[PDB]
Amino acid sequence: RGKLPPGPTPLPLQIGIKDISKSLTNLSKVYGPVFTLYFGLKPIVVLHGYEAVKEALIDLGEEFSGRGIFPLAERANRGFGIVFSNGKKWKEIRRFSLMTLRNFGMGKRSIEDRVQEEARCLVEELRKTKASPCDPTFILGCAPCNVICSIIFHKRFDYKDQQFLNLMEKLNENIKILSSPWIPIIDYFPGTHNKLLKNVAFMKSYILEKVKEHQESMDMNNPQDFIDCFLMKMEKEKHNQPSEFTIESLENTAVDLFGAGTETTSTTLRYALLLLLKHPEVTAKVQEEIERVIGRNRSPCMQDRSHMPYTDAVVHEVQRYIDLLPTSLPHAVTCDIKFRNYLIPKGTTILISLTSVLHDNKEFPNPEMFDPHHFLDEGGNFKKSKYFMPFSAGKRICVGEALAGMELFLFLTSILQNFNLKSLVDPKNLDTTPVVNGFASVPPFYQLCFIPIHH
Ligand code: HEM
Numbered sequence: 001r002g003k004l005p006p007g008p009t010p011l012p013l014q015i016g017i018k019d020i021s022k023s024l025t026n027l028s029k030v031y032g033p034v035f036t037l038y039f040g041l042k043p044i045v046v047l048h049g050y051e052a053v054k055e056a057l058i059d060l061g062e063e064f065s066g067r068g069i070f071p072l073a074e075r076a077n078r079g080f081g082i083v084f085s086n087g088k089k090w091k092e093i094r095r096f097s098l099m100t101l102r103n104f105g106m107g108k109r110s111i112e113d114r115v116q117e118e119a120r121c122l123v124e125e126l127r128k129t130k131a132s133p134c135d136p137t138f139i140l141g142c143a144p145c146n147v148i149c150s151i152i153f154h155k156r157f158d159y160k161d162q163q164f165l166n167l168m169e170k171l172n173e174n175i176k177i178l179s180s181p182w183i184p185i186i187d188y189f190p191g192t193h194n195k196l197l198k199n200v201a202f203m204k205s206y207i208l209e210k211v212k213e214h215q216e217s218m219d220m221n222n223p224q225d226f227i228d229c230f231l232m233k234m235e236k237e238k239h240n241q242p243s244e245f246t247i248e249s250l251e252n253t254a255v256d257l258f259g260a261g262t263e264t265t266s267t268t269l270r271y272a273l274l275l276l277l278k279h280p281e282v283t284a285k286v287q288e289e290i291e292r293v294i295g296r297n298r299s300p301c302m303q304d305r306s307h308m309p310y311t312d313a314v315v316h317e318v319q320r321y322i323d324l325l326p327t328s329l330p331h332a333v334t335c336d337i338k339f340r341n342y343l344i345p346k347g348t349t350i351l352i353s354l355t356s357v358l359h360d361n362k363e364f365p366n367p368e369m370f371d372p373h374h375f376l377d378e379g380g381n382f383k384k385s386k387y388f389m390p391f392s393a394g395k396r397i398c399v400g401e402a403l404a405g406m407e408l409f410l411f412l413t414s415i416l417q418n419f420n421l422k423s424l425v426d427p428k429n430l431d432t433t434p435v436v437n438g439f440a441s442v443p444p445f446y447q448l449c450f451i452p453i454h455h
């Protein structure tokens, strides 16, 4: 009925996501680009290398647009948003969320304005540290979180506001839980399931109390944020009930946008500053480019990027090198599909190696080294690549691709516009090797001085 590709015998100290990814690369040398892992009776089809990922995710987009069971299916039911939803529900909410994130039916304030406002608020907070040793984990975490708050409810927060400090606490708790290594099964069961369920319930309740406030000023001609645009769609999809657009779907989608829209961006920014300390020649050329194209006078904008090939290469190189999410999120085939010499049955888990694409030894000669020239042709021009898949590929490609692109470019140019980067430790012996983590390539702990600008 369904002939899955060949793989090893079933059943395969701490095993982090990078350890998982390295083992997957080892098995691909033995079995080829496409192989099955069997976990007793439960199969997982692994896709290694660009050709296999491209053939499945892009060439057979609809067939590979399903979402896998990733950890444990929480009864709080997170399958009503984007990240964990499937079928018609996913198709509609994803479409709706994409267009809202592309400034459609969200008022006249652009996404860029919000990111630029936060870029200014992020610079002011870094000035407060008065050029003394700082762990940027907190400050870099507040900026992407505040961008999402602004998009969902049209309200940003002060870095000392308790309402903000509570949201971030629940988020950071959920990240710590999610980031637990493995040992066949995940490490984290001495009551961590209930805390996850509790934290998600708190975030949902908080979004729900904001949803009421918006229902007071309900107006068809004045949407100003995500809650308004969704309520307006809910009102437009009544009498055509039932709809995928409900109060609980709005709630889950909002939690999804909060979770996904904070940590990935926050971790990338933290890892970008670490690589800039370790590579002082690279930082100098970036600061040189900002001078000649933007200066110290005005705030950066997305229009500057096309005029800054070297800085664009650094942004892309940070994301290619760090390989933030080595296996993306699990996929599933939506129906029975013929993939090369195999027949994969409906609902079969599909695991994609993003490491195998981002660290391709032919597309990126010496992929293990940090080098902006991986995104530069032989003449020094920006060289875009089909292998740039940090946001994954196909129908499930990160809905926050454009936003995270804006945040990285705008927040990093603004930091390098108003500050020099001073490392406490000599960059020659400064550690960059990522810490063992269950879902992401997270950077090791470091400290730095944010010194106001000088030539
Ligand atoms: C550095 C920043 C980010 C990276 C490297 C990243 C990476 C990804 C990846 C690898 C996936 C999995 C896609 C797949 O299933 O194959 C994903 C999904 C998603 N990302 Fe991101 N993400 C980032 C920032 C964001 C932001 C800023 C937001 C929100 C506005 C966001 C919202 C999502 C959502 C909703 C999904 C679910 C897409 C779907 O399931 O249809 N992400 N992301």
Ligand SMILES: N#Cc1cc(S(=O)(=O)Nc2nccs2)ccc1Oc1ccc(Cl)cc1-c1cn[nH]c1
Binding pocket: 083, 171, 174, 175, 178, 200, 203, 255, 256, 258, 259, 260, 261, 263, 264, 325, 328, 329, 398, 439
């Ligand atoms: N991080 C994160 C994250 C965490 C959750 S949760 O299950 O902890 N519930 C939450 N609700 C609200 C906050 S936390 C849900 C979606 C999230 O997103 C990703 C999760 C895993 C992986 Cl592997 C990737 C993402 C992701 C990031 N950006 N884009 C995708």
